[PDB]
Design a protein around this ligand. Structure first.
Ligand SMILES: C[C@@H]1CN(CC(=O)N2CC(C)(C)c3ccc(Cl)cc32)CC[NH2+]1
Ligand SMILES: [Zn+2]
Length: 107
């Protein structure tokens, strides 16, 4: 799927600005909020609700209403330096602990 970028350098520097990312969405009908997505580092690919992080390059798709941009970012791309910068490690840990412990109660 292409390896995640874990350096301090963004994979897509043209999408480093909040403003730049916001334009990629256009009119956006999806359950998940475009400004929250842009804030969490994501820009739209024009492939349904598929987004990529400007920094790690990590892709996310098929957004349910209960799925948070930042939480998903941490879930699937925990090495992302943008994520670490914006949210910090104690946020990242709680959210991993949370999804792991969720992946117990159902079974
Ligand atoms: C918002 C959530 C995202 N979920 C995971 C997802 O969408 N993944 C995780 C994976 C690393 C396999 C991946 C690779 C490329 C793309 Cl484009 C997406 C995804 C699915 C439910 N909705
Ligand atoms: Zn990222």
């Amino acid at each position: 799927m292409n390896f995640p970028n874990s350096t301090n350098l963004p994979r897509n520097p043209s999408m480093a600005d909040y403003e730049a990312r916001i334009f990629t969405f256009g009119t956006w009908i999806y359950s998940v909020n475009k400004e929250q997505l842009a804030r969490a580092g994501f820009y739209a690919l024009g492939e349904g609700d598929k987004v990529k992080c400007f920094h790690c390059g990590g892709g996310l798709t098929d957004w349910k209403p209960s799925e948070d941009p930042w939480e998903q970012h941490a879930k699937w791309y925990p090495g992302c330096k943008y994520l670490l910068e914006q949210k910090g490690q104690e946020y990242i840990n709680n959210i991993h602990l949370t999804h792991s412990l969720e992946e117990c109660l159902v079974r």
